[PDB]
Amino acid sequence: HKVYICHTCGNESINVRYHNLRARDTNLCSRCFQEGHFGANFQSSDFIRLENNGNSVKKNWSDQEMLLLLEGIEMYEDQWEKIADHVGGHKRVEDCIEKFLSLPIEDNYIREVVGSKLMECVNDAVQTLLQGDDK
Amino acid sequence: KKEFPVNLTIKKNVYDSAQDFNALQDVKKNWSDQEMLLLLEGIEMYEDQWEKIADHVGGHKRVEDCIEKFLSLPIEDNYIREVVSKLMECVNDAVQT
Amino acid sequence: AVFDLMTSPFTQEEVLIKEIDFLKNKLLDLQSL
Amino acid sequence: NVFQSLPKETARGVDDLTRMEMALLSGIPEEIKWSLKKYLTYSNKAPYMISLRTLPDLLPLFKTFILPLERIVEGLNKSSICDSKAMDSLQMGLNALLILRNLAQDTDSVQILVKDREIKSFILFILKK
Amino acid sequence: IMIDAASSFVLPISITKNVDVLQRTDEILWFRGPSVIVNERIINSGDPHLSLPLNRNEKESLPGPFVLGLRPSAKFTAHRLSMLR
Amino acid sequence: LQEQSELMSTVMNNTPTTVAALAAVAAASETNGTIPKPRSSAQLEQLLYRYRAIQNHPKENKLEIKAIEDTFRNISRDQDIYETKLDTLRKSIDKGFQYDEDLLNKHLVALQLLEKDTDVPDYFGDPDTEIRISARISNRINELERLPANLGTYSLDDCLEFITKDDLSSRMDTFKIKALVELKSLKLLTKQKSIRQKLINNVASQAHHNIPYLRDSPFTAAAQRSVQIRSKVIV
Amino acid sequence: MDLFSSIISKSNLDKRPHELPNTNFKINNVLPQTDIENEAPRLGFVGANTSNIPDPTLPPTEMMTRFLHPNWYALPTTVWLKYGNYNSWAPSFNENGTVVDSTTRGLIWLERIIKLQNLYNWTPSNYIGDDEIENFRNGTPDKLVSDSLLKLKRLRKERILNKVLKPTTEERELYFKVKRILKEVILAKKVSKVPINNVRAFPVLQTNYNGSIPVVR
Numbered sequence: 043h044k045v046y047i048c049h050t051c052g053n054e055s056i057n058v059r060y061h062n063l064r065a066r067d068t069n070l071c072s073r074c075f076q077e078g079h080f081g082a083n084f085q086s087s088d089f090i091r092l093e094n095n096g097n098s099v100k101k102n103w104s105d106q107e108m109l110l111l112l113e114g115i116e117m118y119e120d121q122w123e124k125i126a127d128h129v130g131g132h133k134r135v136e137d138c139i140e141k142f143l144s145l146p147i148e149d150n151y152i153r154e155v156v157g158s159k160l161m162e163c164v165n166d167a168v169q170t171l172l173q174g175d176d177k
Numbered sequence: 178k179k180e181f182p183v184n185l186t187i188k189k190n191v192y193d194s195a196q197d198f199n200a201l202q203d204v205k206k207n208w209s210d211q212e213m214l215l216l217l218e219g220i221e222m223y224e225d226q227w228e229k230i231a232d233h234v235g236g237h238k239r240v241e242d243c244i245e246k247f248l249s250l251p252i253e254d255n256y257i258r259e260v261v262s263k264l265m266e267c268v269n270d271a272v273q274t
Numbered sequence: 275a276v277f278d279l280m281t282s283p284f285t286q287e288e289v290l291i292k293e294i295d296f297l298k299n300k301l302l303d304l305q306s307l
Numbered sequence: 308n309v310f311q312s313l314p315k316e317t318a319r320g321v322d323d324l325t326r327m328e329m330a331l332l333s334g335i336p337e338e339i340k341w342s343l344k345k346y347l348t349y350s351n352k353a354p355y356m357i358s359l360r361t362l363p364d365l366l367p368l369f370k371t372f373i374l375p376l377e378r379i380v381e382g383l384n385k386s387s388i389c390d391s392k393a394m395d396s397l398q399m400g401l402n403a404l405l406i407l408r409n410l411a412q413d414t415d416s417v418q419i420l421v422k423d424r425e426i427k428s429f430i431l432f433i434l435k436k
Numbered sequence: 437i438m439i440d441a442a443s444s445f446v447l448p449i450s451i452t453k454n455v456d457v458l459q460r461t462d463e464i465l466w467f468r469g470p471s472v473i474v475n476e477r478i479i480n481s482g483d484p485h486l487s488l489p490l491n492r493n494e495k496e497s498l499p500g501p502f503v504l505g506l507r508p509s510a511k512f513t514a515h516r517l518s519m520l521r
Numbered sequence: 522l523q524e525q526s527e528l529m530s531t532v533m534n535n536t537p538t539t540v541a542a543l544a545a546v547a548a549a550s551e552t553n554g555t556i557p558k559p560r561s562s563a564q565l566e567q568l569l570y571r572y573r574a575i576q577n578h579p580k581e582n583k584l585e586i587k588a589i590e591d592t593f594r595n596i597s598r599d600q601d602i603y604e605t606k607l608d609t610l611r612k613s614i615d616k617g618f619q620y621d622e623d624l625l626n627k628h629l630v631a632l633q634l635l636e637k638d639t640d641v642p643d644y645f646g647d648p649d650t651e652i653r654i655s656a657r658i659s660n661r662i663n664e665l666e667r668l669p670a671n672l673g674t675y676s677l678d679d680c681l682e683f684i685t686k687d688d689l690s691s692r693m694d695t696f697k698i699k700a701l702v703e704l705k706s707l708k709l710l711t712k713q714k715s716i717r718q719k720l721i722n723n724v725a726s727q728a729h730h731n732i733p734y735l736r737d738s739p740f741t742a743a744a745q746r747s748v749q750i751r752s753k754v755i756v
Numbered sequence: 757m758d759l760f761s762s763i764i765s766k767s768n769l770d771k772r773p774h775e776l777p778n779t780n781f782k783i784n785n786v787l788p789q790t791d792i793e794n795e796a797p798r799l800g801f802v803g804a805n806t807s808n809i810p811d812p813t814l815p816p817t818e819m820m821t822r823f824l825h826p827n828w829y830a831l832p833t834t835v836w837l838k839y840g841n842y843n844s845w846a847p848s849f850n851e852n853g854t855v856v857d858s859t860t861r862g863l864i865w866l867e868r869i870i871k872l873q874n875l876y877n878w879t880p881s882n883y884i885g886d887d888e889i890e891n892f893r894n895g896t897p898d899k900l901v902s903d904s905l906l907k908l909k910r911l912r913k914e915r916i917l918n919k920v921l922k923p924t925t926e927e928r929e930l931y932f933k934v935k936r937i938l939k940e941v942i943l944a945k946k947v948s949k950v951p952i953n954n955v956r957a958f959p960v961l962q963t964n965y966n967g968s969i970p971v972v973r
């Protein structure tokens with residue numbers, strides 16, 4: 043389990059952080075977000091409520107983890123240790139790569155635009171010929 | 178089977194573009210968010226009686242228009258993903274030889 | 275381009291001498307043809 | 308403190324040459340395939356490492372694959388190779404025969420092959436057929 | 437335009453006697469600007485008080501701000517608490 | 522030149538009597554190519570209502586009032602025809618049909634999928650067809666990038682949490698995360714293509730040392746054996 | 757530096773006198789800001805590229821151009837040699853490291869060669885009227901629905917395969933004509949289930965506000 047130091051103060055976030063999407067490496071507590079202590083450049087639209095708790099049994103991939111994975115891939119372009127800790131550190135490199143490859147992203151558009159027995163019977167006949175000497 | 182989820186609730190309507198939700202848009206037929214929440218609220222409880230819903234919304238909406246609205250609510254993704262002579266030619270030659 | 279560790283009765287210098295003696299001959303064979 | 312003074316040269320397991328020499332000496336067939344592939348690569352690329360003058364207990368380790376190939380050559384006048392177990396022995400025998408062919412252009416790995424009075428029986432057998 | 441300014445400050449004197457109601461560090465946190473009080477988070481996007489249709493000087497004293505905030509009705513909440521157990 | 526958007530621009534600029542589109546043959550008829558019978562439900566009709574209600578003051582400078590009133594007559598006539606046909610249509614119903622359930626399911630799901638432009642399964646190379654795929658993805662990107670950033674949910678399960686005037690419910694962002702997973706997954710497409718190339722061109726690039734039924738065939742073993750033949754030493 | 761505090765959680769029903777841990781404190785009232793939320797930016801502003809990936813509308817979208825699986829490699833076979841015009845006793849070919857023989861390779865070579873209430877009540881779903889549903893309501897109601905949805909699916913394929921984005925005026929007109937019929941049965945027949953499946957959420961706008969700490973240059 044990591045720790046999330048709240049930006050603009052020194053506090054520790056309890057179980058819910060508010061991730062910023064334009065500095066991309068800051069967080070906030072709930073109380074610093076309710077009152078608007080996050081500087082006049084940001085606008086309270088670009089803060090997603092993320093959690094901090096350990097999720098359920100693995101290979102579930104909640105939308106928070108998918109979002110943080112794609113944030114990491116936009117950040118680093120490589121360096122899957124620096125992706126897997128940014129997911130939360132409770133996932134391995136060898137599973138983040140197995141999940142970024144197994145995503146149907148353009149499969150729906152492919153399905154939009156684009157909508158023998160003889161020798162097996164011969165093999166069964168030969169397997170029947172290799173049973174009794176009389177043939 | 179794994180499928181990318183068909184997120185209908187985000188998707189803006191193509192044919193009419195006037196039956197969307199009020200956030201995706203940029204008697205009276207206006208359908209504010211309070212009557213919309215009352216409509217989903219009445220459909221969760223009353224289960225298609227169309228007259229307790231028709232005044233649970235608040236009386237400005239006809240039953241015809243409530244059906245007109247109910248025909249354009251998005252469906253769950255996990256329900257779209259839920260509803261959706263060559264034999265004898267060898268034997269006759271294997272019996273002989 | 276894969277290296278290796280192994281045991282041998284020769285030192286590491288003598289192995290390099292044998293590598294020179296082999297690669298000069300293969301170099302002459304392939305540059306001649 | 309005791310886990311800091313490890314010798315760096317042996318902390319990868321065994322070296323690869325003893326790995327190849329033990330893999331053939333066992334009976335696991337896929338590990339024999341791996342060992343013969345690596346012996347073939349080292350015989351092509353650097354034959355002096357597998358010079359028979361240096362490693363004397365290596366030529367019977369190839370005789371034990373090459374000498375049962377005579378039965379296969381005897382039975383090869385009919386469609387003998389039926390399952391996938393005799394064919395694997397055939398391919399191992401041909402690959403070991405190639406390894407001894409590749410080691411025989413050295414003039415110091417050659418006299419050991421000549422003084423053996425049993426490889427010449429195999430050569431005479433193949434030539435008679 | 438910088439990002440990494442401090443924008444919170446702490447005075448050295450421990451005045452922690454009557455302060456259990458404010459936001460403590462765990463001292464007292466003293467920011468570089470005030471707070472922002474927001475009445476209701478969810479806008480009610482229709483409602484001709486706000487939508488202003490183009491058809492047809494009048495005042496109206498509405499009860500509270502709770503008209504503009506999507507509150508659920510109590511019969512659903514009792515129905516859901518009945519569905520609880 | 523989009524006169525049905527020029528009326529909207531004159532309405533939203535709050536100055537429509539000051540110009541009034543200069544209704545002559547040179548201006549009011551150059552944009553029409555009568556008026557073209559507006560398409561929307563009321564978004565192009567309330568504009569005509571306001572346009573007639575503003576043009577009641579001059580009443581003679583604008584000659585195009587008569588065609589607009591003819592279209593009002595057309596709308597009233599079509600409405601009366603539809604009301605008579607709806608009166609007859611509710612009288613033309615059979616007393617018993619007993620409409621089947623498991624086809625009503627399919628018609629509802631099929632209509633809902635055909636509303637919002639997604640592919641419906643039936644249950645009833647070539648760079649021509651490469652651009653026709655790569656022009657549907659730009660559609661979805663430039664449709665998701667026009668959503669408002671202050672998008673939020675209101676599920677039917679916040680009633681069990683008793684949210685006060687300022688309490689910050691914990692299911693407010695179940696649509697804005699989903700509307701960014703799509704928008705950033707449709708921009709990381711030519712990164713997973715470049716990872717899949719490095720995967721396939723290093724799994725299929727061996728193809729004869731890992732797959733067992735290929736490295737045990739006669740011809741593959743013979744080729745791998747025959748590439749390793751060291752050249753003959755003359756003398 | 758001129759600092760500020762947090763909001764005191766003193767209730768509106770407290771009525772106590774204002775105590776102060778310091779007399780060098782001052783107290784102020786915070787007026788809540790309230791109005792139509794200032795138009796928030798779009799999602800293209802929130803989460804644009806800060807990377808070096810390309811757009812997925814660039815011409816390299818191939819993924820298989822120079823693949824060449826090793827089932828498709830050229831295998832070494834026999835090399836037939838030609839000496840001259842009158843050399844018919846020479847060793848004719850050469851097989852150093854071949855896979856197959858001369859006989860099988862020769863065989864492989866061989867086998868290849870003006871009212872008022874009738875004017876505000878107005879949709880585009882009633883401009884057409886009905887004109888057919890009266891006639892078809894006398895029999896079954898459901899055949900026209902499937903025969904129209906198949907036409908919608910065919911027209912949607914024909915719009916995908918034509919690089920057109922706006923729907924035509926021929927299927928829009930044909931869309932509402934579907935949605936009318938499915939309405940009327942629900943008006944008339946009261947079919948025994950009419951199933952309910954909703955996502956149990958719907959998107960609403962929420963208030964935005966700038967931060968209160970000023971900018972630092």
Ligand SMILES: [Zn+2]
Nearest residue numbers: 048051071074
């Ligand atoms: Zn904080």
